[PDB]
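Can you give me the bound-state structure? Components:
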Amino acid sequence: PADQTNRTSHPLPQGVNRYFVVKSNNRENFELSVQQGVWATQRSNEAKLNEAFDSVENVILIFSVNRTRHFQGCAKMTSRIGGYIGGGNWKHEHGTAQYGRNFSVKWLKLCELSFHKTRNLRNPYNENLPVKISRDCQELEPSVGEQLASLLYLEPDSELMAISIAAEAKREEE
RNA sequence: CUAG
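Here's the bound-state model for the whole set.
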């Protein structure tokens, strides 16, 4: 009874964060990311994630699979792109849009956040369009990013959350 | 990217 209420997701790190919407063409890659703690983006996006990674303590990546009408969670970018990381043999069609280098992520919160529920939120960095209209690695104006992440934390954990925590712990035993 |  001395034990604090134990938690099943990681809270949004405190401090000065930047926020990017990350898009996947398919669930398979997103699920692989969750099992392995790894992502890779399009080559053209790598310098901008590295610029964010160098600039602030936490780069928060809010994921959404194309066409699912939902956000699926948020991760912290935990390594700079460049440098061997490993994992992630990714699915893609006839070699097109071939992905860049794998980097580490830590899944903070996994859930299914409907776009309906984000419909009053717009992003000044993308012409004040609703945040659902976000290409891969579009930056969220940071006050809007913090609002969008806060909506994620209102949703119940999806089944992937515990999958993530388990995989994360397994990688920790070294 | 969102919509079909």
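A couple of observations. Residues 21, 23, 64, 66-67, 69, 115, 126, 129-130, 132-136, 138 of chain A lie near RNA strand B (CB under 10 Å from a C1'). Strands of chain A lie at 17-24, 38-39, 58-65, 70-77, 103-114, 122-123, 129-130, 138-140.
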